[PDB]
Design an enzyme around this catalytic site. Structure first.
Site, PDB file in Angstrom:
ATOM      1  N   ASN A   1      -2.730  -4.446  13.847  1.00 31.74           N
ATOM      2  CA  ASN A   1      -4.229  -4.567  13.782  1.00 31.74           C
ATOM      3  C   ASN A   1      -5.066  -5.256  14.846  1.00 31.74           C
ATOM      4  OD1 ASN A   1      -4.441  -2.266  11.709  1.00 31.74           O
ATOM      5  ND2 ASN A   1      -4.437  -3.900  10.364  1.00 31.74           N
TER       6      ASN A   1
ATOM      7  N   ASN B   1      -2.279  -9.904   8.282  1.00 33.90           N
ATOM      8  CA  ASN B   1      -2.223  -8.438   8.741  1.00 33.90           C
ATOM      9  C   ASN B   1      -3.505  -7.993   9.294  1.00 33.90           C
ATOM     10  OD1 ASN B   1       0.538  -8.742   7.640  1.00 33.90           O
ATOM     11  ND2 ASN B   1      -0.001  -7.733   5.955  1.00 33.90           N
TER      12      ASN B   1
ATOM     13  N   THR C   1       0.860  -1.229   0.162  1.00 35.89           N
ATOM     14  CA  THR C   1       0.040  -0.019   0.154  1.00 35.89           C
ATOM     15  C   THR C   1       0.965   1.255   0.102  1.00 35.89           C
ATOM     16  OG1 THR C   1      -2.055  -0.994   0.933  1.00 35.89           O
ATOM     17  CG2 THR C   1      -1.657   1.335   1.559  1.00 35.89           C
TER      18      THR C   1
ATOM     19  N   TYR D   1      -6.809  -7.656   8.632  1.00 37.72           N
ATOM     20  CA  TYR D   1      -7.645  -7.032   7.917  1.00 37.72           C
ATOM     21  C   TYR D   1      -8.984  -8.091   8.257  1.00 37.72           C
ATOM     22  CZ  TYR D   1      -4.622  -3.694   6.996  1.00 37.72           C
ATOM     23  OH  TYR D   1      -3.472  -2.752   7.198  1.00 37.72           O
TER      24      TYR D   1
ATOM     25  N   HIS E   1      -6.160 -11.674   0.394  1.00 39.81           N
ATOM     26  CA  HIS E   1      -5.401 -11.305   1.735  1.00 39.81           C
ATOM     27  C   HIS E   1      -6.140 -11.586   2.933  1.00 39.81           C
ATOM     28  CE1 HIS E   1      -2.967  -8.832   4.350  1.00 39.81           C
ATOM     29  NE2 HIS E   1      -3.509  -7.534   3.682  1.00 39.81           N
TER      30      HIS E   1
HETATM   31  C1  LIG Z   1       4.289   0.813   3.546  1.00 41.77           C
HETATM   32  C2  LIG Z   1       3.658  -0.609   3.647  1.00 41.77           C
HETATM   33  C3  LIG Z   1       2.552  -1.038   2.871  1.00 41.77           C
HETATM   34  C4  LIG Z   1       2.228  -2.433   2.981  1.00 41.77           C
HETATM   35  N1  LIG Z   1       1.046  -2.709   2.445  1.00 41.77           N
HETATM   36  C5  LIG Z   1       0.671  -3.997   2.286  1.00 41.77           C
HETATM   37  C6  LIG Z   1      -0.662  -4.585   1.680  1.00 41.77           C
HETATM   38  O1  LIG Z   1      -1.238  -3.735   1.163  1.00 41.77           O
HETATM   39  N2  LIG Z   1      -0.882  -5.855   1.665  1.00 41.77           N
HETATM   40  C7  LIG Z   1      -0.193  -6.741   2.525  1.00 41.77           C
HETATM   41  O2  LIG Z   1      -0.490  -7.759   2.583  1.00 41.77           O
HETATM   42  N3  LIG Z   1       0.786  -6.168   3.264  1.00 41.77           N
HETATM   43  C8  LIG Z   1       1.202  -5.007   3.182  1.00 41.77           C
HETATM   44  N4  LIG Z   1       2.329  -4.888   3.787  1.00 41.77           N
HETATM   45  C9  LIG Z   1       3.229  -5.699   4.561  1.00 41.77           C
HETATM   46  C10 LIG Z   1       4.266  -6.039   3.352  1.00 41.77           C
HETATM   47  O3  LIG Z   1       4.032  -6.718   2.340  1.00 41.77           O
HETATM   48  C11 LIG Z   1       5.441  -7.253   4.096  1.00 41.77           C
HETATM   49  O4  LIG Z   1       4.774  -8.454   4.512  1.00 41.77           O
HETATM   50  C12 LIG Z   1       6.218  -6.317   5.373  1.00 41.77           C
HETATM   51  O5  LIG Z   1       6.548  -5.016   5.063  1.00 41.77           O
HETATM   52  C13 LIG Z   1       7.374  -7.085   5.585  1.00 41.77           C
HETATM   53  O6  LIG Z   1       8.364  -7.381   4.625  1.00 41.77           O
HETATM   54  P1  LIG Z   1       9.572  -6.169   4.329  1.00 41.77           P
HETATM   55  O7  LIG Z   1      10.426  -6.381   5.805  1.00 41.77           O
HETATM   56  O8  LIG Z   1      10.582  -6.851   3.377  1.00 41.77           O
HETATM   57  O9  LIG Z   1       9.183  -5.043   4.491  1.00 41.77           O
HETATM   58  C14 LIG Z   1       2.762  -3.198   3.726  1.00 41.77           C
HETATM   59  C15 LIG Z   1       4.126  -2.831   4.276  1.00 41.77           C
HETATM   60  C16 LIG Z   1       4.403  -1.465   4.364  1.00 41.77           C
HETATM   61  C17 LIG Z   1       5.881  -1.117   5.035  1.00 41.77           C
HETATM   62  C1  LIG Z   2      -4.442  -0.686   2.949  1.00 38.87           C
HETATM   63  C2  LIG Z   2      -4.007  -1.827   2.745  1.00 38.87           C
HETATM   64  C3  LIG Z   2      -4.468  -2.820   1.715  1.00 38.87           C
HETATM   65  C4  LIG Z   2      -3.230  -2.244   4.086  1.00 38.87           C
HETATM   66  C5  LIG Z   2      -2.021  -1.518   4.212  1.00 38.87           C
HETATM   67  C6  LIG Z   2      -1.100  -1.784   5.232  1.00 38.87           C
HETATM   68  C7  LIG Z   2      -1.006  -3.583   5.416  1.00 38.87           C
HETATM   69  C8  LIG Z   2       0.351  -4.005   6.504  1.00 38.87           C
HETATM   70  C9  LIG Z   2      -1.853  -4.516   4.729  1.00 38.87           C
HETATM   71  O1  LIG Z   2      -1.795  -5.558   4.876  1.00 38.87           O
HETATM   72  C10 LIG Z   2      -2.796  -3.806   3.823  1.00 38.87           C
END
Ligand SMILES: Cc1cc2nc3c(=O)[nH]c(=O)nc-3n(C[C@H](O)[C@H](O)[C@H](O)COP(=O)(O)O)c2cc1C
Ligand SMILES: C=C(C)[C@@H]1CC=C(C)C(=O)C1
Ligand SMILES: Cc1cc2nc3c(=O)[nH]c(=O)nc-3n(C[C@H](O)[C@H](O)[C@H](O)COP(=O)(O)O)c2cc1C
Ligand SMILES: C=C(C)[C@@H]1CC=C(C)C(=O)C1
Ligand SMILES: [Cl-]
Ligand SMILES: [Cl-]
Ligand SMILES: [Cl-]
Ligand SMILES: [Cl-]
Ligand code: NA
Ligand code: NA
Ligand code: NA
Ligand code: NA
Lengths: 399, 399
Positions: free
Chosen positions: B251, B194, B37, B196, B191
């Site tokens: 969350n 996390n 995101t 949701y 998804h």
């Molecule tokens: C800015 C940001 C946005 C993220 N958005 C999502 C998301 O939309 N869906 C999701 O499943 N995880 C999301 N995550 C979690 C990441 O996919 C990932 O699991 C997490 O950042 C750990 O990996 P990393 O240490 O390589 O960043 C987000 C993480 C960050 C930091």
């Molecule tokens: C707005 C989303 C779809 C979320 C953004 C941040 C994280 C960690 C997600 O898993 C989904």
């Protein structure tokens, strides 16, 4: 003779030789004798062998501070069905067990009684002879065709336990646990492994019930956890352990072919940890490894490579005893005992090596076992396996 | 600048650089972009950013054969609640997604749309403004006090979904999946991680329901598995993956403090494997590692050391993508990719390194990320992070 091609390793420099407390017992090393049925108990009455059992356990208690889990012991006549396995329900039985426990304690070792209910592994004809039911979780799935046929021939069809009958077994587990402690045991192990009755409830192959004791993970675990809770209440969590074999197929359990099997066992582990965090932590969890899915197959056979028991460690945070083909694999034990709450059960090679612990410490050859006398009404293959020194005197370092 | 104290390792000699097939896609390496995101979508209508989104994905698609999972995309207005995250329900949205998918494919890479329903993480005031409910599994436990208060202030109290409303979300998941494929995506990721909505059903903290959608492991998993089954039917198992975070606390999920958490996730994995053995194997399972229990804490913080995801591998036998603090730990990746069905998701450092894959292959320094622009309505901190060459030209090898 000694096992021919075995290359021993001295394990004295590993955690296998670091002391650890299990329940009330200060173990001096982490080589455990797992439960081993030997069929020397005498009929009638399932009496521990009056001639040889004390000597058998005395021999195997010789290394100070060894934890011994007894051969499986039936909690009641209805729980049994093998004429030559012992029970722990009668005065005549406990007279013999008292002598055994005293002898083990004199050697400065410890003894935990494994409590057994056979379910569908029992012989239906022995049970019919004695006016007893042939029990399991369900009545529409059988261990094998031969057992189903023996049951029908004996007019003793496999019977799905009622709730009242489950409660009666729980009463018997409680009294057997009390009997064991009163006679001098250090604790008990609840047998929920190897396809006996409790495992028959845990496994969805053998448990097709639609009441509260089957049809889901929680329901299938209910009986095992009720026994755990009843014994914890009766004699204390520090005197109770639990044995599980997640990947076992012996006695027609599912093993890894059941995709829900890890979830089933993870649930049990989680419920134990929940109880532990609430102030009642079991002394230990004892796991049969996927290294041995059937303990009557030669080491290396029946290995399941598609699963690990390591998951249990993410859940249960207490001591874990692991058993299965470790005697011939010091290289594996060396890695496993790096975990500081891991103990190693050595089964078949404790049958043949009364001084196994010395041999593990010092990297000595192992006596070959004779599977033909694993179950036999004899001192031979029971109390006449030599120590290392005795074997040297017999010329085994050159046979 | 480059990350100051990082000691890179070239990973080109590892399985990270061995090709693998995921669903219909022949990946050329196993460094995956997990869903991230970024909040550049425009209001009203949750429209993918018309100015910068194509360039953002084009940059990150530059290494041929890269698997990209999109930022989370809402399946419907009711599923959303963040004004600047995109949806996949409208024609106006899909016009933009089509351009994005085309651009990724032109770079010879692949794109999987992550399908999102927010549940209690949504902003109740945005939802009230738009005439929408504030949804979760239950109505008597809240994400935090602030969310509970925002909901009350908005006259939009947290609402426990009815069965009909769950069915409506499932219809929306199905249509969103169809929309994604029709616009040119290679697949979708459900998804269920996390914290949701789907994770809110899986977790016993957030799910206190007493109907068929809560109160047991099977019941808590029901919604997630119904979505899996609906999408498999709609667009095929080869176009569907599932994301889970067993040890996550983000969350207000339970994480390892819940002793039943491994059992809950083992059950889901088992049900996926059951479906696989019956002919419908999901393209992949995507796991967030206990290395990162909250992705808004700096790498190394919020690590849970009391659990491992390794259990999943004993159960699910298909591809597994693992994500969480791997960019700064090539030594860990080197060990994990020895397993031949393991892929590695790199999140935060893919934000800051559009050419991350080259950098991993060649053991190059990594651009530091700027967390302040992770969520921002700007090209800055989105499409202006330099490639390695561009960074050299800016003098970063000496800054
Ligand atoms: C800015 C940001 C946005 C993220 N958005 C999502 C998301 O939309 N869906 C999701 O499943 N995880 C999301 N995550 C979690 C990441 O996919 C990932 O699991 C997490 O950042 C750990 O990996 P990393 O240490 O390589 O960043 C987000 C993480 C960050 C930091
Ligand atoms: C707005 C989303 C779809 C979320 C953004 C941040 C994280 C960690 C997600 O898993 C989904
Ligand atoms: C002759 C024999 C008797 C056994 N009896 C029992 C028993 O009473 N209870 C039990 O839980 N396991 C029993 N087992 C299984 C063992 O405790 C152990 O798990 C298995 O033999 C694997 O360990 P090992 O390779 O070191 O022998 C028995 C195994 C054998 C070979
Ligand atoms: C008679 C018994 C108590 C059984 C013997 C063989 C095995 C593998 C057991 O688990 C118990
Ligand atoms: Cl018999
Ligand atoms: Cl471990
Ligand atoms: Cl917003
Ligand atoms: Cl693994
Ligand atoms: Na004699
Ligand atoms: Na026999
Ligand atoms: Na611009
Ligand atoms: Na924010």
């Amino acid at each position: 003779s000694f096992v021919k091609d075995f290359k021993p390793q001295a394990l004295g420099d590993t955690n296998l030789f670091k002391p650890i407390k299990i329940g009330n017992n200060e173990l001096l090393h982490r080589a455990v004798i797992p439960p081993l049925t030997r069929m020397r108990a005498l009929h009638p009455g399932n009496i521990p062998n009056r001639d040889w059992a004390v000597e058998y356990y005395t021999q195997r208690a010789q290394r100070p501070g060894t934890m011994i889990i007894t051969e499986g012991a039936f909690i009641s006549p209805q729980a049994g069905g093998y004429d030559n396995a012992p029970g722990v329900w009668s005065e005549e039985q406990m007279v013999e067990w008292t002598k055994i426990f005293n002898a083990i304690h004199e050697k400065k070792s410890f003894v935990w009684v494994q409590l057994v209910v056979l379910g569908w592994a029992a012989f239906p004809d022995n049970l019919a002879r004695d006016g007893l039911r042939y029990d399991s979780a369900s009545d529409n799935v059988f261990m094998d065709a031969e057992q189903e046929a023996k049951a029908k021939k004996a007019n003793n069809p496999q019977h799905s336990l009622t709730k009242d009958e489950i409660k009666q077994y729980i009463k018997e587990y409680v009294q057997a646990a009390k009997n064991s402690i009163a006679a001098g045991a250090d604790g008990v192990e609840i047998h929920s492994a190897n396809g006996y009755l409790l495992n028959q409830f845990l496994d969805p192959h053998s448990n097709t019930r639609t009441d509260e004791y089957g049809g889901s993970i929680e329901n299938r675990a209910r009986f095992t956890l009720e026994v755990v809770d009843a014994l914890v209440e009766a004699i204390g969590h520090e005197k109770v352990g639990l044995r599980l074999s997640p990947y076992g197929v012996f006695n027609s359990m599912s093993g890894g072919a059941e995709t829900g099997i890890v979830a089933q066992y993870a649930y049990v582990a989680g419920e134990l940890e929940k109880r532990a965090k609430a102030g009642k932590r079991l002394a230990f969890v004892h796991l049969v490894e996927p290294r041995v899915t059937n303990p009557f197959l030669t080491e290396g056979e029946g290995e399941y490579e598609g699963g690990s028991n390591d998951f249990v460690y993410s859940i249960w945070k207490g001591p874990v005893i692991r058993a299965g083909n470790f005697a011939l694999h010091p290289e594996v034990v060396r890695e496993e005992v790096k975990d500081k709450r891991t103990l190693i059960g050595y089964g078949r090679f404790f049958i043949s090596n009364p001084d196994l612990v010395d041999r593990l410490e010092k990297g000595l050859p192992l006596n070959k076992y004779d599977r033909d006398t694993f179950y036999q009404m004899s001192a031979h293959g029971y109390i006449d396996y030599p120590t290392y020194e005795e074997a040297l005197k017999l010329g085994w370092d050159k046979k």
